Scaffold this active site. Structure first.
Site, PDB file in Angstrom:
ATOM      1  N   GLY A  32      15.270  -2.971   6.577  1.00 55.34           N
ATOM      2  CA  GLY A  32      16.098  -3.522   5.725  1.00 55.34           C
ATOM      3  C   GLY A  32      17.366  -4.379   6.483  1.00 55.34           C
ATOM      4  N   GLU A  92       5.433  -0.817  11.656  1.00 59.04           N
ATOM      5  CA  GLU A  92       6.717  -1.028  11.246  1.00 59.04           C
ATOM      6  C   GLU A  92       7.296  -2.311  11.912  1.00 59.04           C
ATOM      7  OE1 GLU A  92       8.111   1.680   9.530  1.00 59.04           O
ATOM      8  OE2 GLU A  92      10.190   1.051   9.291  1.00 59.04           O
ATOM      9  N   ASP A 144       0.768  -1.291  -0.003  1.00 60.53           N
ATOM     10  CA  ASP A 144      -0.001   0.047   0.281  1.00 60.53           C
ATOM     11  C   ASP A 144       0.797   1.420   0.019  1.00 60.53           C
ATOM     12  OD1 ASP A 144      -2.156  -1.745  -0.165  1.00 60.53           O
ATOM     13  OD2 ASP A 144      -3.017  -1.158   1.787  1.00 60.53           O
TER      14      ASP A 144
END
Lengths: 279, 279, 279
Positions: B168, B191, B143
């Site tokens: 990452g 997150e 999204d």
């Protein structure tokens, strides 16, 4: 430079007769001023010995004049050869390898930086937005969908994590910009806005939302304060208890930032971010 | 392929003499390797029977060599015919209808995907960022202003909601990437970072912030743990009480993720996301 | 217009024989309808006297037909002369100064707006995303990395702060879109999704996450409700206490939105946002 400052102050008080058709000394001084801002050779706010940040108001006035000098125009480069409509050019307008070589920062597509924002050597701009008059110092990491708002001062080695927003402050003239001092780590999804200051070496976790209305709470005592995180703070998202519901021993709690540790340069150098946030 | 792996391992240990001028077998192996990553024909981490995720370190080494092989260059296409400055090309560099047809995913302007990220058929990329070495499996929904960080493994039918960031993990070599397993729903503004793993069929609400330092708390018991959400978990934002203030019966509370339900494949199939999050 | 509505209703019930090769009255009606949406001359939902919002279902049907009429195609303009792959054109496709002049809004690179979203005069689009069928009314501020989802209705003078996401609602037909009424301020990192409604003059703080599953809690009483923020509410992030852990007097708390003040037009006019959020 003193002459530039003089021309800008007079021009700003006469700003109602400055427009896209203005040329001469006023166009040149405003132009030069924003170029100096773009190169970090001057800055909107600077830290004094005395350890506080002072606004260079004439620089905010140069930026405000540039709105009057520069027209709305069609700006090419959108999807399917479509366009944008604005009056502020990209920092990178007309830049070749010579300009990127000299500046020494990394600009990952499709980051956006407006002209008059200083990006220092060894900064890394992930897809992100840096607004007018910002100052992003050496080695700063501006992660994906971060935002560095107008006039914001971002210190050396500062890490703005994913989705971190640093609020812009242009007007009023006297209003100090949002300041993140040297060597702060700011965890993902956090926001610092409205001229709040995070002092040097602080570590904010994820979802720490500081503006002028946010209670920043001392873990030890409950002391509530506003607008400033002290040096070498470790700050996380939390709450404080509210009023209990009629006749009951409980109630809803409300968001606050919590200072969980008041640490040290030594400690910050000896202790990982995750160690600081964990125990 | 075994030959590629051999060339990359030797090259990586000799990486100090690999640079933009390198050609031959080393340039070809690194190139091929990233192409295989881009097509999902190999992946940075894979789930073993044994049910755990194993890092293919040589693939992280290929990615790291590609930084040495590829120069910083001016990358056209910014606003007003301006440019970027980076050394990683778009996944979509030179792609025509043939390549998009074959890949079968949707790429909404102005999403950004770096070469070596696999996007599976029937994925939908809203404006978002997918980094090097990521693996986005079939039917995944990425999204608006979501982020899929370097080497991240995103399962089949995973929904990453607005503003969701998946952290990452490139270095260190041994470090496992962030993993969102098959059929997870991840609510807006959440997150998950730093090699944390969300196991299959889990439902995270909005503002769930999981990294290596985040307490993930069992609702029933208060059990605190780190780094892993069990299968078919329902997890929401919350807090745990802290120390009371001197002499008082109250104190500030601190953010944690809360596992509110430990559910079932059956239950996930029978119960809507909102039902799960509500009661 | 009544004829358009008639053509669309019949076409939608026959939609299985509508495709990229369709022309005549069906292509023209769908085209006209989305043009009317793009100009705000019609809207997906409108507020009735009776004070509630009614869905114009035929307009959702026009949008859904446009998916069938319009092909996936390569869309130029990505980094390094690369392309996207989608079937919805930019609102700004082929726009010159004439079109931007007439519309009267500001479109800062690199904002994305899909055709059929209405942007009213004096709106400001920072880098952000406005989806199909949205209605962004006069003077609205759409801050950086905000999102205005499909069919969403954004009131006059509404401020969507940095990273604020307003959830899209296309299907089902009957489902009301997400509504932010006139003069709301929505603080940074907040999300309102799934057809929830924030009534006129409300002030949300940072990290307020409202969807159909979010408890919106009355501060005074603990009253829990869903889907609607009353007019002139001041709403902040918080929690409610959960079950205590076995044999103990404490437990984890869970996220909720908290209505901290039920204010007034008069009060909103007399009191700053930060004053409202602070005391």
């Amino acid at each position: 430079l003193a002459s530039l400052e003089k021309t800008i102050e007079k021009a700003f008080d006469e700003r109602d007769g400055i427009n896209t058709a203005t040329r001469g000394e006023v166009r040149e001084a405003v132009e030069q001023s924003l170029i100096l801002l773009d190169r970090g050779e001057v800055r909107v706010a600077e830290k004094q010995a005395d350890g506080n940040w002072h606004v260079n108001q004439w620089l905010k006035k140069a930026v405000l004049l540039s709105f009057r000098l520069n027209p709305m125009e069609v700006i090419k480069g959108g999807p399917g050869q479509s366009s944008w409509w604005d009056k502020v050019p990209s920092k990178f307008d007309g830049w070749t390898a010579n300009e990127f070589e000299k500046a020494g920062f990394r600009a990952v597509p499709n980051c956006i930086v407006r002209h008059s924002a200083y990006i220092a050597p060894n900064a890394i701009l992930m897809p992100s937005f840096v607004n007018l008059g910002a100052y992003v110092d050496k080695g700063a990491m501006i992660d994906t969908w971060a935002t560095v708002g107008s006039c914001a001062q971002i210190g050396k080695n500062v890490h703005l994590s994913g989705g971190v927003g640093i609020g812009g402050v242009l007007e009023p003239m006297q209003a100090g910009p949002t300041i993140i001092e040297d060597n702060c780590f700011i965890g993902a999804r956090s926001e610092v806005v409205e001229g709040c200051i995070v002092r040097e070496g602080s570590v904010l976790g994820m979802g720490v939302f500081i503006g002028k209305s946010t209670k920043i709470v001392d873990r030890a005592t409950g002391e509530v304060f506003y607008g400033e995180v002290p040096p070498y703070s470790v700050v996380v998202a939390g709450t404080m208890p509210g009023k209990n519901v009629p006749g009951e021993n409980w109630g809803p709690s409300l968001y606050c930032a919590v200072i969980v540790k008041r640490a040290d340069e030594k400690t910050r150098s000896k202790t990982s971010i995750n160690e600081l946030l964990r125990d």
